[PDB]
A paper describes a structure:
The diazabicyclooctanes (DBOs), including avibactam, relebactam, and others, are a new BLI class with improved activity against a wider range of SBL targets than classic BLI scaffolds.
The imine group points toward the flexible Trp105, but otherwise, the DBO core closely resembles intact relebactam. However, in the [name]-2:relebactam complex, both Trp105 and the relebactam piperidine ring are modelled in two conformations. Therefore, movement of Trp105 and binding of the piperidine ring appear linked, with the potential for steric clashes to occur if Trp105 was positioned to face the C2 side chain. However, in each of the three [name] complexes, in all of which relebactam was a modelled as a mixture of intact and desulfated forms, Lys73 is at least 0.4 Å more distant from Ser130 than is the case for either the CTX-M-15 (either conformation) or L2 structures. These increased distances, when considered with the postulated recyclization pathway that involves proton transfer from Ser130 to Lys73, in addition to the distance of at least 3.5 Å between Ser130 and the N6 of relebactam, suggest that recyclization is less favorable in the [name] complexes than in those formed with the other two enzymes.
Residue numbers in the entry: 25 to 57, 59 to 252, 254 to 294
Write the structure that this text describes.
């Protein structure tokens, strides 16, 4: 059921000047679209969705966790912390940091939550606990964005991202209340309007998390999409390119998402 219908991903990535990795899963039939799906790509900010899921999993064993107020100093505010900078003088709850990390890609929030989990290895351990043997987080913000060609640090594959996203949003990896909270955070993302969402009709529900390393043409998005009248679709689109100064493209991500939906026979 993989690649029943071929799609022109090679032409797309050639025009982009790099590599595109796509995995998409029709959760009803099990049909998939797969292109470079087992190659590694840098996560960039996209690890923050899984980070929030890991916090929610922890909160199943610690009922007070989400409501815990976290204070932080100015030294915690690394570049691109649009929410946590507004609450420097007050603090934010763990839930609020999680929402900020997911929905605004807040870097300070992400580092504060990584500390809660025992750092990159703690997040990696959570991913292992749900059966993901590919994911690895190695570094913190901002160093995890280096996106060096051939460097496996801070990478996963489109396939493993999609498989893990499915487990967390639709499967049983989270308890039902936590699962719905994760979904709701993804649905409220503000940074993805020009990526997978641009390929998804407005009358379908969708949650996503983006990433943009800023070098090596490296950017990404993953999403859970609910077309009306059929089972949900899970998909991941990752990009990279050979040169440090190569630019990312949101349009290429949206175009790859459209090809994936077309390959699954999902009318969009
Ligand atoms: C994540 O990839 N981020 C955080 C933020 N928005 O994330 S996104 O998914 O909407 O793109 C800005 C881009 C990126 C990030 O942390 N960029 C840093 C800029 C400075 N150099 C290190 C990377």
């Amino acid at each position: 059921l993989t690649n029943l219908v071929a799609e022109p991903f090679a032409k797309l990535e050639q025009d982009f000047g790099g590599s595109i990795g796509v995995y998409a899963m029709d959760t009803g039939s099990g049909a998939t679209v797969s292109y470079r799906a087992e190659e590694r790509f840098p996560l960039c900010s996209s690890f923050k969705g899984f980070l929030a899921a890991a916090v929610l999993a922890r909160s199943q064993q610690q009922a007070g966790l989400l409501d815990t107020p976290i204070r932080y100093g100015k030294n915690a505010l690394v570049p691109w912390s649009p929410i946590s900078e507004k609450y420097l003088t007050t603090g934010m709850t763990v839930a609020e940091l999680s929402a900020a990390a997911v929905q605004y890609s807040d870097n300070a929030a992400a580092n504060l939550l990584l500390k809660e989990l025992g750092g990159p290895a703690g997040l990696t351990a959570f991913m292992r606990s749900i059966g993901d043997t590919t994911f690895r987080l190695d570094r913190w913000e901002l160093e995890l964005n280096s996106a060096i060609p051939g460097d496996a640090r801070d990478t996963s594959s489109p396939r493993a991202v999609t498989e893990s996203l499915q487990k967390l949003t639709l499967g049983s990896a989270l308890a039902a209340p936590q699962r719905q909270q994760f979904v709701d955070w993804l649905k409220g993302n503000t940074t993805g309007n020009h990526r997978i969402r641009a390929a998804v009709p407005a009358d379908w529900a969708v949650g996503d998390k983006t990433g943009t390393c800023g070098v090596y043409g490296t950017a990404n998005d993953y999403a859970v999409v609910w077309p009306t009248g059929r089972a949900p679709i899970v998909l991941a689109v990752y990009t990279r390119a050979p040169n440090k100064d190569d630019k990312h493209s949101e349009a290429v991500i949206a175009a790859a998402a459209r090809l994936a939906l077309e390959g699954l026979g999902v009318n969009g």
